[PDB]
Paper text:
Urokinase-type plasminogen activator (uPA), which belongs to the trypsin-like serine protease family (clan PA, family S1), catalyzes the conversion of the zymogen, plasminogen, into the active serine protease, plasmin. Plasmin generated by uPA participates in the turnover of extracellular matrix proteins in physiological and pathophysiological tissue remodeling. In this study we have solved five crystal structures of the catalytic serine protease domain of muPA in the absence and presence of allosteric molecules and/or substrate-like molecules.
The protease domain of muPA crystallized readily in its unbound (apo) form, and we obtained a 3.05 Å crystal structure of apo-muPA. The asymmetric unit contains four highly similar apo-muPA molecules with the highest root mean squared deviation (r.m.s.d.) of 0.12 Å for 224 Cαs. Apo-muPA displayed several disordered regions including the N-terminus (residues 16–24), the 70s loop (residues 71–77), and 140s loop (residue 143–149). Remarkably, the structural comparison revealed a 180-degree rotation of the β9-strand (residues 180–184) in apo-muPA. This results in a transition of the β9- and β12-strands from an antiparallel chymotrypsin-like conformation in human apo-uPA to a non-chymotrypsin-like parallel conformation in apo-muPA. The consequence of the antiparallel-to-parallel transition is a complete rearrangement of the active site architecture. The antiparallel-to-parallel transition of the β9- and β12-strands causes a 15 Å translocation of the 180s loop with the 170s loop to the distal side of the protease domain thereby collapsing the architecture of the S1 specificity pocket. In addition, the oxyanion hole (NHs of Gly193 and Ser195), which stabilizes the negatively charged carbanion during catalysis, also collapses as the antiparallel-to-parallel transition causes an 8.9 Å upward shift of the Lys192-Gly196 segment. Collectively, the observed disorder in the 140 s loop, the translocation of the 180 s loop and the 8.9 Å movement of the Lys192-Gly196 segment, results in a collapse of the activation pocket thereby making Asp194 inaccessible for forming a salt-bridge with the N-terminal Ile16. Thus, the antiparallel-to-parallel transition of the β9- and β12-strands results in a muPA conformation that is incompatible with substrate binding.
Numbering used by the authors: 25 to 37, 37A, 37B, 37C, 37D, 37E, 38 to 60, 60A, ...
């Protein structure tokens, strides 16, 4: 749901109507929100979007800068390098200010003993904020995909593989997207980037997430 790190990105609608909900993101820095690049590739300009933080919510930000990954590409199977950075700012010129309703979520450690983490949950639907479920999932390596029947019994959880062009993925390519959270070292962590749409909440066919840990450098190359 709405834990202090959740950011609701909206797309400024034309005319007098109200902006519509677009895709979700995570507050990784007081001045930075991470989200899916495929939510912006069709309108790549900063001024068409407004992010909301807090409990609309407790804080309104306009995006001073919109950074899509330079190697973003959509083949007919999945979104590769599907990651985007939003530098947020208020009308008063301030960035997001920490509280008990607005906190930053931890980024993946560069290295840890159990890289996949524990109790991983994806965000997604089952059109508007709060039809959003957080479904517990099972991250897997590319070897347990395409053939999980050769590794274990079937459970009612969805399996997800890290996005990779060399290994055929076949995952839903929704028009929306959001964060994948795992518990690394006992702390909630922005582990992945998933897409929201039809076929994105289904359990029997494995899906695909953009693995945040593979972009650390890139991220920090824009945050530091
Ligand atoms: Ni890895």
């Amino acid at each position: 749901e709405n834990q202090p790190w959740f950011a609701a990105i909206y797309q400024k609608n034309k005319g007098g109507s109200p902006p519509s909900f677009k895709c979700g993101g995570s507050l990784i820095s007081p001045c930075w929100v991470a989200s899916a690049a495929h939510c912006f590739i069709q309108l790549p300009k900063k001024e068409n979007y407004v992010v909301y933080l807090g409990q609309p919510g407790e804080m309104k930000f306009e995006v001073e800068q919109l950074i899509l990954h330079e190697y973003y590409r959509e083949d007919s199977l999945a979104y590769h390098n599907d990651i985007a950075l939003l530098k947020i700012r208020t009308s008063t010129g301030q960035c997001a200010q920490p509280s008990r309703s607005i906190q930053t979520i931890a980024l993946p450690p560069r290295f840890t003993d159990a890289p996949f983490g524990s109790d991983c949950e994806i965000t997604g639907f089952g059109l508007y904020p709060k039809n959003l479920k957080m479904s517990v999932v099972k991250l897997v390596s590319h070897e347990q995909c395409m053939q999980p029947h050769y590794y274990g019994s079937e459970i009612n959880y969805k399996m997800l593989c890290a996005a990779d062009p060399e290994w055929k993925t076949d995952s839903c390519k929704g028009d929306s997207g959001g964060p994948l959270i795992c518990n690394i070292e006992g702390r909630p962590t922005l582990s992945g980037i998933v897409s929201w749409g039809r076929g994105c909440a289904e359990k029997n066919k494995p899906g695909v997430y953009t693995r945040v840990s593979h972009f650390l450098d890139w991220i920090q190359s824009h945050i530091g």
